[PDB]
Ligand binder design. Structure first.
Ligand SMILES: COc1cc(C(=O)N2CC[C@@H](O)[C@@H](N)C2)cc2nc(-c3cc4cccnc4n3CC3CC3)n(C)c12
Ligand SMILES: COc1cc(C(=O)N2CC[C@@H](O)[C@@H](N)C2)cc2nc(-c3cc4cccnc4n3CC3CC3)n(C)c12
Ligand SMILES: [Ca+2]
Ligand SMILES: [Ca+2]
Ligand SMILES: [Ca+2]
Ligand SMILES: [Ca+2]
Lengths: 554, 554
């Protein structure tokens, strides 16, 4: 914020003083007993026997507008000063309004500052990009021996792109000033009062190689001498943070439902109309969003912009929750992995894991799901809205809850009932000593993740509801749903779309969810076998959190 | 920290309870109006109408040592428990002593916890590696249906290596359990009381791809069933932080001096004996150190373990200093770069810049040095010990301080003096209007870095001493020392080794440094031209900071 001016009695020196910067006066370097200083009314002097600082009232109308005299004894030293205004303004307040300490630090929190960029993936496009403005109030003859340059570091040049508005708020594809080939650009700025606009976009999300910060700097160069290299008289910069990709949980109000089978769509359209949300007809993707003060856009990841564990079916997120003081307003991303690494065990690709962490707003949690033949966490866990407590309920698949249901059917006298209507008897399933040992192991696997979710999400038992579900053993001792899993249901607010288990099973599940004020409608064919993968029924785009991610302190 | 035990009236269940973990008791899942519980004296129960937790007094001597009865009404439910002790202990206290919340988080600061590893670059080698111990107090027949496994994540397996002490504190190269090919390893542990030692080393320094954390986890597996996959009953882990490479400034007391010319070595040996430190005779390197509670080793980087801007001559570090509240106990690393990126400008390789930042203890500062033909920061800045103020003085090269010296020689009547004894007259140098414009530009470049160092290091003018130094212009308008630069001197405590400028110049420099209690001895040939580079004279290994880097909060 400081500049040092060294004056000398032999020759009057010229200097530029940018409004908003502390200007220091050097005296003893070229001086003698005492000194006295008299200046112009437009120059403020505050400090005499032999530190002096200068403050400008306003901008200059001509070169050498103001002056300062240094009397030492008595020989006088002259100083012709030029006060100019240079300010690179952006949305540092995050209130959607552009405003001109510290300016070189991006800070999390409500009492913090720092602008936000959106990832890109005509005025129509300009409504997405961020806006920074440059204000210059200089003498009319100032830029004959001075020049400004906007620049970004070579490491961040490919992560960002800056445009210059040619006519008003419009621009062409040739008006680029900063990009993955142009680390810097010389600005053509006229004398007098002039404000030019810049439109900035991000080219990449935060990652393990890119923390998510982009600094754009303006520099004032002195070009009064042809023989000597350019001299930096002043530098100002604004720090941009690239907005993270944020996942939305089932507790967030739905907006649009997608589906892809005959009697299936009828029950879906019924539920969508009851919850009053859009449904369009035309599983390996996740529909999140990016949020900026000016605009908020839906983003879909898969491969409205855009092993067996690398899928996004293994990607889930919890409702807002507070864990041991630490608050997670956007919830926590949940995904599956093995307990310990081995040659036969699999894990999510490290690139995908690190990407989730880069978006610090939803601190990921490694769960145990390697036991499942598919391996996705949504096979044994889910979330539903609740009127009381923390406002939600964690749904876990439970072989014990289902075995208790069957064992009482024998007690009631309904042990002759058959399912899958190859069909099998309920008495045979209960008497099946082999199946009981399998579900006992499956129960154990879920019980581990149960305590994991109770710990990392800070949950009590009064926040968990066990959904009766049976599991069998596929090849390589892997687990698999015995019947269509209820837990992987479709949540549309207070209107559920639980898969039909093929009823006594349906009767119990409702008794667990209906007291929460939930409407249970079962679907004949939620899941369909594609020949050799099982595909999910639908997909939902839900309303982004009211909580602004930048106000969070990871 | 929790495990859930589900008991049932139909069959008594067996369970393992690790000492130090909260054990929860599940009742209502297989129950009825009221319940009452009576247990063994070795089992503590705290909660009856229809949450219960169990606490173990000590470790078991046999399987099913303790028992718990659940009476519900009246049908009783039995529970055979096995209390075992499993603790993976390391130097979490950083006091050099191994001791058994939170255990999964490494925290900076004096009131923080977390172990430290050293980078590797026989008991002799064992004195460097870190030590973690595992304590197991189990029944004699415990590991017939249980097994332990030590493991590290696949992303951190190549950053770490763990050994197992075969005989006492000795080990062979075959006793490796964890490495860049072994993510996990099955531990052979006998029943009863048993403690085995592990020796751990780091394979890589903190970097942009490796933040510097390594987690080692022990897992308890239940292998009572052959048909069913292994079941994780318990997990415990310790987090290791890889110690960063730390630079030492001239203010730190020297220990050993290296040199590589006839009359040169005599003046060096004189200075080394006066400062009382070792000197061995046998410039493109930097001698830092890594620090652990148990051992501290010197590390040299170049290419006692181990463009023109990519050198380490451009690498310097400041004394301990506090900047705007923020405290930097190990100082700040200084290096050179351009003001703004261009096609003709150069910068330090991004890999090297990011590496310096990874070692967070000395937050790097980008300075302007692109103007120099060489480009190193040590050409125009240096640090010396001081009795008062912040305990040091910043030495900056100053063309103005040197021009003031010459102009007074004309005033005194000594304007006929010649240097380089092609030789040149001092009057001709002063009358040289071309040289004055060059140094005026060079002065401007240093004045920029002057305010940069006053800002980032929080320095006042009373901490800076201008050393008289002239600069000329090499090809491509680059700057170069007119005469041997004084500022790039050899600091050995309160004994300096300033280069001889070829005296009136020497007389002034001493008057600036001697009041600081510094002894000034000048050297005839400090710098030597090698045909086409200039090489530094000597190099110093200085004492590491008393301040422990792990107590710092970056
Ligand atoms: C592969 O195993 C599964 C995963 C998921 C799940 O929840 N998935 C799927 C994978 C990813 O998409 C996750 N994100 C979500 C649901 C499943 N339902 C069943 C199932 C079992 C069954 C038995 C008889 C009749 N019908 C039965 N069905 C349903 C019917 C298709 C056959 N199985 C075997 C499922
Ligand atoms: C290349 O320019 C330089 C760099 C450094 C420096 O400080 N360096 C060197 C580079 C890196 O090692 C940095 N880390 C440290 C010191 C220098 N002294 C002189 C110099 C100029 C001169 C003129 C006449 C007689 N002698 C003269 N000398 C000394 C004598 C060798 C000729 N020049 C030109 C220097
Ligand atoms: Ca767009
Ligand atoms: Ca999903
Ligand atoms: Ca060693
Ligand atoms: Ca150096």
């Amino acid at each position: 914020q400081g500049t040092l001016i060294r004056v000398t009695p032999e020759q009057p020196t010229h200097a530029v003083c940018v409004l908003g910067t502390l200007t220091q006066l050097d005296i003893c370097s070229s001086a003698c007993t005492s000194f006295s200083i008299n200046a112009s009314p437009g120059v403020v002097v505050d400090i005499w026997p032999l530190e002096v600082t200068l403050t400008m009232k306003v901008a200059s109308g001509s070169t050498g507008d103001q002056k300062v005299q240094i009397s030492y004894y008595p020989v006088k030293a002259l100083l012709y000063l030029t006060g100019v205004e240079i300010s690179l303004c952006a949305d540092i307040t995050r209130t959607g309004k552009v405003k001109p300490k510290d300016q070189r630090t991006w800070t999390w929190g409500p009492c913090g500052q720092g602008a936000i960029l959106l990832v890109n993936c005509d005025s129509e496009d300009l409504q997405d990009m961020s806006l920074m403005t440059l204000s210059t109030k200089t003498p009319k003859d100032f830029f004959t021996n001075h020049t400004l340059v906007l620049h970004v570091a070579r490491s961040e040049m490919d992560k960002v792109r800056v445009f210059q508005a040619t006519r008003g708020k419009l621009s062409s594809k040739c008006s680029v000033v900063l990009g993955p080939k142009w680390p810097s650009h010389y600005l053509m700025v006229p004398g007098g009062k002039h404000n030019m606009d810049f439109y900035v976009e991000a080219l990449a999300f935060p990652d393990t190689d890119f923390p998510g910060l982009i600094t754009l700097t303006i520099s004032l160069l002195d070009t009064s001498n042809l023989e000597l290299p350019e001299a930096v008289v002043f530098q100002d910069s604004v720090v941009f943070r690239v907005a993270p990709w944020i996942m939305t949980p089932n507790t967030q109000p739905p907006q649009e439902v997608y589906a892809c089978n005959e009697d299936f769509l009828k029950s879906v359209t019924t539920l969508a109309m009851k919850a009053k949300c859009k449904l369009t007809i035309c599983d390996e993707m996740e529909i999140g969003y990016i949020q900026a003060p000016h605009k908020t856009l839906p983003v879909v990841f898969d491969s409205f912009g855009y092993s067996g564990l690398d899928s996004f079916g293994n990607l889930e997120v919890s409702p807002p929750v507070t864990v041991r003081g630490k608050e997670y307003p956007l919830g926590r991303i949940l995904f599956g992995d093995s307990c310990y690494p081995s040659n036969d065990s699999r894990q999510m690709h490290q690139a995908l894991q690190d990407f989730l962490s880069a978006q610090q707003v939803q601190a990921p949690v490694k769960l145990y799901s390697d036991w499942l033949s598919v391996g996705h966490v949504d096979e044994f866990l889910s979330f539903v809205p609740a009127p009381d407590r923390k406002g939600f309920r964690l749904l876990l698949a439970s072989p014990r809850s289902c075995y208790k249901l069957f064992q009482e059917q024998q007690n009631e006298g309904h042990g002759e009932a058959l399912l899958f209507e190859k069909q099998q008897k309920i008495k045979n399933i209960l008497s099946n000593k082999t199946l009981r040992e399998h579900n006992s192991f499956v129960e154990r696997c879920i019980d581990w993740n149960r305590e994991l979710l109770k710990r990392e999400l800070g949950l009590a038992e009064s926040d968990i509801i066990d959904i009766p579900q049976l599991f069998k053993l596929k090849e390589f001792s892997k687990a698999e749903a015995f019947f269509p899993n209820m837990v992987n249901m479709l949540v549309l607010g207070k209107h559920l779309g639980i898969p039909k288990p093929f009823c006594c099973l349906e009767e119990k599940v409702c008794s667990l969810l209906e007291p929460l004020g939930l409407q249970c409608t079962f679907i004949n064919d939620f899941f369909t076998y594609h020949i050799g993968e099982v595909h999910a029924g639908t997909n939902v785009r839900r309303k982004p959190f009211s909580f602004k991610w930048w106000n969070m302190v990871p």
